[PDB]
Structures are given as C-alpha cells and as structure tokens.
C-alpha cells in the first residue's frame, strides 16, 4: 500500500473498495500498489489465485486484465511495527520486503469472497487472563505489604 509519503505499508485486509477515481483502496483511501484502476463500466470483478484482477465490461464477453496484485513477503513476520488499521511498515528487524506474485516464492493464494478471521481463540485468552489476573492480585498484595511495613516503621 502507498502511504501519503510515497513509502510502503502492508496489510492483510483485502476488503478492497473503489474511490471516486477508480483506484483500489483499503479503508482510508490507501491507494494500493501497484496502481490499479477499476473501470467506470465495471459489471463484475474477479481475482484469481495468482492475483490477476480482471473486470467484465458491458457488451464485451471477456475479462480484460486491468491489474496485477502481487504480495510482499518479509523474512521476519514478527518484526513488523504496526501503526494501526492492521497496517505494518517495514522495519530493520523485519527485513527487506520481497515483492512477488501470489502462489510463488513461498507466498500464499488469494481467495475471493473470503475474509480472514482473527487468530484469537476465546478459550485460550480466557485461561491466560485467569492466570494473569491472579498474578496481578499477588503483585498488588506485595505492594500493599511493603506499604504497611513502611508506615509501621515510621510509626516507630
């Protein structure tokens, strides 16, 4: 994705939308890269598992190739620094971005009509929360104990 600087951001949100000028954006006018311009006379749009975005024009029975939508792969996924919107910008620990066609070079495929759900299991988070809350309780108890120690020491 192109930020207003001319830099690069990267998002796993493919709920793409059409602006007034036809460029493909993602929830914020983020003009995707490389530049992709949906035609005005679009009837239906398709995006294969190799990322070619092609549209149905009126009258013509052919999906003209309007753009190509390749992915970007980093050697360290964890290193990314989020800036909100589920966007991540390149950083020194993430590694240089490798821009490549979907399906190849270790990348994935592009599925139309799907949204990827968050990888958060409620049960795991709740058991984690129980553990953490007990630890929090014990730590506040320790703080209060030191408080009592000091205030008695001064009562001396």
């Amino acid at each position: 994705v192109m930020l207003p600087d001319g830099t690069s951001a990267y998002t796993r949100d493919g709920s793409f939308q059409v602006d007034q000028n036809g460029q493909l954006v993602t929830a914020g006018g983020f003009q995707v890269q490389p530049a992709i311009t949906i035609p005005a006379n679009a009837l239906s749009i398709t995006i294969g598992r190799d990322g070619v975005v092609s549209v149905t024009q009126q009258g013509q029975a052919a999906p003209v190739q309007v753009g190509q939508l390749n992915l970007t792969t980093f050697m360290n996924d964890t290193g990314l620094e989020s800036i909100g919107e589920n966007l991540y910008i390149e950083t020194q620990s993430s590694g240089a971005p490798n821009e490549s066609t979907p399906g190849l070079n270790g990348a994935g495929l592009l599925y139309q009509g799907y949204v990827e759900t968050s990888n958060v299991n409620v049960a795991e988070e709740l058991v984690n929360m129980i553990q953490v809350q007990r630890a929090y309780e014990i730590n506040s108890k320790a703080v209060s104990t030191t408080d009592q120690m000091l205030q008695k020491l001064t009562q001396l």
Partner: peptide, 18 residues
Amino acid sequence: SSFLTLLVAQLKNQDPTN
C-alpha cells in the same frame, strides 16, 4: 472439552490465601 480447560484453569490458578 473447551470448557473443561476453564475448570483446570480456575483450579490451578486460585489464590492460596483466598
């Protein structure tokens, strides 16, 4: 099975004082 992890999480993570 998923709700059984919540029992062992509550039993294994109770405050010994209270």
